[PDB]
């Protein structure tokens, strides 16, 4: 009942504070309503404040805000374009996979999973794939199964050449560890992609 431009302009003096406050339900609603505003306020407003807002949401404490920001980033990369976020969002997300905390690493893995189906297959071959390949030697048992699930998800997206060249040996190497959860996840990924 209200024009998109009007509601996006009226919520400008309030989004500078409601985006980061104590509660998270308001933040969840703001993240859910953002994709209807970032596409109308242009691109300069995005790289001005919305990029920082999303980068701050991606490292929030709770998990609901993190997954909401992940879905919002997916919607934004589907609405704006592919090559636009190749040098603005992808490097900043890939640079987060170096922290000693496993939560940020799991967040980056979830972002790689959600962006592998929108960013085609040419970028996810030499830009986002080497990170998932190198994050396999992580001694944290709660990151190896996430990496295996990410490989399973990006399996059908990537061609058979990449799945047979480097994905199969690293999966065979991952299937020979001592943990049981990561081993079952890797065996399921092998048996669903018909790679073994």
């Amino acid at each position: 009942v209200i024009g998109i431009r009007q509601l996006s302009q009226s919520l400008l003096p309030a989004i500078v504070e409601l985006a980061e406050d104590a509660k998270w339900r308001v933040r969840l609603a703001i993240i859910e309503y953002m994709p209807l505003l970032a596409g109308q306020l242009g691109v300069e407003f995005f790289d001005e404040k919305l990029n920082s807002l999303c980068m701050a949401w991606l490292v929030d404490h709770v998990y609901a805000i993190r997954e909401a920001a992940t879905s919002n980033l997916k919607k934004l990369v589907e609405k704006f374009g592919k090559e636009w976020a190749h040098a603005t969002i992808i490097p900043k997300v890939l640079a987060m996979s170096g922290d000693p905390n496993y939560l940020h690493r799991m967040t980056t893995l979830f972002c790689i999973n959600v962006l592998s189906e929108v960013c085609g297959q040419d970028i996810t071959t030499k830009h986002m794939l080497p990170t998932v390949l190198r994050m396999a030697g992580d001694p944290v048992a709660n990151v190896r199964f996430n990496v295996a699930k990410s490989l399973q998800k990006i399996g059908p997206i990537l061609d058979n050449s990449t799945l047979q060249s480097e994905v199969k040996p690293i999966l065979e190497k991952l299937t020979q560890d001592q943990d049981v959860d990561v081993k079952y996840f890797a065996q399921e990924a092998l048996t669903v992609l018909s790679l073994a």
Binding site: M55, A56, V59, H61, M96, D99, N101
Partner: protein, 56 residues
Amino acid sequence: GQTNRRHTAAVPGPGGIWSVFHAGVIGRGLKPPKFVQSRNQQEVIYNTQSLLSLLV
């Protein structure tokens, strides 16, 4: 048988505008030594044999 340079190169929570993500440490964490007794199996019972022979 039986300091701050590395904390500065990765600080500011990768944002330079907010506090740290955690709320501090409890003790030290990740005990360095974690050593296990793996000296030898052979030539250990012979020392016990020599000690028992001396005691006899």
